[PDB]
């Protein structure tokens, strides 16, 4: 993929209790990714942008929540989540 595509696939870290537990006991890092990204381009961007060795990526789509308001029924955006597993010993810092 061209050099503009690497800067647009990762959106940022996902912060949660599940995400924090995986970063310690499994060296597994959760990211928010573009909704049209694929496993192969996610893998390359992480390697290029953070300069580490990644072994496997698993991905899931998340449906946005629907909230009822006085003026109707609105819903939030759908987003995509990536579980990124690194080499046995190494960290993903910024």
């Amino acid at each position: 993929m061209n050099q503009e595509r690497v800067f647009k696939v990762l959106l940022g870290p996902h912060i949660s209790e599940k995400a924090t537990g995986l970063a310690d006991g499994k060296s597994q890092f959760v990211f928010k990714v573009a909704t049209d990204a694929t496993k192969l381009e996610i893998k390359k961007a992480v390697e290029s942008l953070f300069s580490v060795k990644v072994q496997r990526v698993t991905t899931l789509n998340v449906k946005g929540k629907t909230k009822r308001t006085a003026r109707g029924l609105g819903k939030r955006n759908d987003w995509k989540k990536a579980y990124i597993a690194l080499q046995p010993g190494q960290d993903l810092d910024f």
Partner: protein
């Protein structure tokens, strides 16, 4: 970054101006998600500099 000085550059210079702006935009989004983004006005500022470089790049043809 006004367009007048952008027009003073070459095509090869403007592509690395463009490429260095996308890196800056990535750092701001990474820093926003974590939470240590103090100046939130930088997000929209970099977007319009990217749109400005692409305009002058297309004008070169």
């Amino acid at each position: 970054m006004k367009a007048n000085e952008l027009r003073e550059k070459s095509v090869e210079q403007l592509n690395e101006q463009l490429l260095g702006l996308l890196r800056d935009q990535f750092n701001l989004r990474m820093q926003k998600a974590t939470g240590q983004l103090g100046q939130s006005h930088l997000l929209s500022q970099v977007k319009r500099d990217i749109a400005r470089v692409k305009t002058v790049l297309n004008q070169q043809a």
